[PDB]
Structure formats: C-alpha cells, structure tokens
Amino acid sequence: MGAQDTLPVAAAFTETVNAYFKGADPSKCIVKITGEMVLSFPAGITRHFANNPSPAALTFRVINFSRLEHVLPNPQLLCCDNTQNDANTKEFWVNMPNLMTHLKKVSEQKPQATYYNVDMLKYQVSAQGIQSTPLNLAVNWRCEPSSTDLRIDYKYNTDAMTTAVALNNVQFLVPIDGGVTKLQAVLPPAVWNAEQQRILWKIPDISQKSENGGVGSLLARFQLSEGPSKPSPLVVQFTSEGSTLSGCDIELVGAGYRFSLIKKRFAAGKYLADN
Ligand SMILES: [Zn+2]
Ligand SMILES: [Zn+2]
Ligand SMILES: [Zn+2]
Ligand SMILES: [Zn+2]
Ligand SMILES: [Zn+2]
Ligand SMILES: [Zn+2]
Ligand SMILES: [Zn+2]
C-alpha cells in the first residue's frame, strides 16, 4: 500500500563440462568445467522505486563459493567483500547506477524483449579428473584393411553432480574413415550418415534410473572399400537441468528483490574420447 515493492529477478547457473578420455586409462582423462552466473531482469522496469526514497540495493551471496577454482565477476557491475574469511560463501554488491544504465541501453537495443540477461560471473569449477565427469567414456577400435570394429563403453557417474539428475538428449558421434560401404553389425540402433561418413547414436535419457543403471555399450562393425580406417575422436553431447556440477547456490541479502527462479543446468562442451 505504501511499501517498497519486492522486485522480481531470475538467476541462472549454467555450467559447461569439457572432458577428454584416452582409451580406458582414467589417469589421462582431462577435465575442464566452466560456468557463468547470469541475472535476468524483466522488461524496462529499471527504476521501480529508485527515486524517493533510494532504490533497494541489489546484493547477493554465492553459496559454496570455494567450489570455484577461478572466478571473474563483471567489473562493470560488481564489487565484493575482501576477505575471504574463506567461509565458503561470497557477498557481491551490484553497482546500481551502472545496472540502471546497462538495463536502459539494451532495452533501447532489444526493445521487443520481455527480459534482459546480464552476465554477472564467469567461473571455473574445481575438478578432479574422471570423478568429475558426469558420463565416463572408454572407446576401442579394431582397424582391418577391409573392416572396422567400434566399441564405446559409457557409465553414468553420480558423484560428478551435486544432485542426481538425468543426462538428456545424449548423442554419440563418430566419423568413420576408410570408405564405409555398409555397417554389418550395430547395437543399439544407430544412424549411418554416408554424406558426412559418420555414425550417430541417440539416447534420450541416461541416469541411475536408466535400464542399465546408466552403464552401457555401443557396438558397430563397418565394411571398408579403401581401408584401413584411422581412429577419430568420439564426440558426445548432452544437457541436464536441475543441478550444477559446482553445487553453487545464490541468495539475496536485504530487501527489495525476490528470486522468481534460480535455474541450474549443465551441458557437455567439448566432450571427446580417443582410442
Ligand atoms: Zn512499483
Ligand atoms: Zn587453474
Ligand atoms: Zn560496487
Ligand atoms: Zn570482487
Ligand atoms: Zn553495459
Ligand atoms: Zn556469456
Ligand atoms: Zn542464508
């Protein structure tokens, strides 16, 4: 009635996992997880009680901050608390004039948009080799001058994510050299693309709940006209929603704002496996 509005803001932690597997030797697995924290602001609002009295401070705390190996806050929009009484959380103050400036500008440049996203934090999540990959991979090739056999073994890895959630739209793509004429063996079903000379398996979901507890194999045998094939990296895609790999969370400090939603998701970035 005479009260400072609560202002609606959305938050997102979006993380990307890059992994390289080599044969079945977990020691040579190389993992890099990057991420960003994005704040989204509803249309044009910008000032919703900013004049008299002053606009509410937008301040937030990142929970489980120590899980991040490296962090780069947006230098135009944020300052934070030093120290670093390493208490695992970190408080950030948003520069309100620079935010108002910023939210006015894109509103002029994306004027038909309902919402404006702002990159608040870019980061890298501490990883520990294969333990940190959500989908462990191992690939093996047998290259005959006249034939090629391919096996890919995968395992859903529970302990890579803060909460156990499914990997969605999982794709396994492998280019097959050597002039394939036909595939004479394949399991489970896959698609062979003659134009790009590569095979593709799609699995809708992979989790603890999956038919095999998320452990499985992909097998194919190819007949060649101009072999041998040379092993090429398997390239994998997947996305997941409802969890991060970091386990970081976000909370508001003081009044003025409410998180309409805090989205957490991760997806494979460059996610490869060599023979
Ligand atoms: Zn209002
Ligand atoms: Zn580093
Ligand atoms: Zn500041
Ligand atoms: Zn700082
Ligand atoms: Zn700007
Ligand atoms: Zn970005
Ligand atoms: Zn709290």
Author numbering: 554 to 828
Please share excerpts from the published article on this structure.
To gain further insights into the mechanism of DPF-motif recognition by the μHD, we solved the crystal structures of the SGIP1 μHD in two different space groups. The two structures are similar to each other, and the minor differences in the secondary structure composition are probably due to crystal packing effects. The structure of the SGIP1 μHD adopts a topology similar to those of the previously determined μHD structures. However, the SGIP1 μHD possesses unique structural features that distinguish it from the other known μHD structures. Among these distinctive features, the most prominent one is the presence of the SGIP1/FCHo1/FCHo2-specific insertion of a relatively long α-helix (α2) between β6 and β7. Due to this insertion, the loop between α2 and β7 and the N-terminal part of β7 also adopt conformations strikingly different from those in other μHDs. Since these regions contain critical Eps15 interacting residues (see below), these unique structural features of the SGIP1 μHD are functionally relevant.
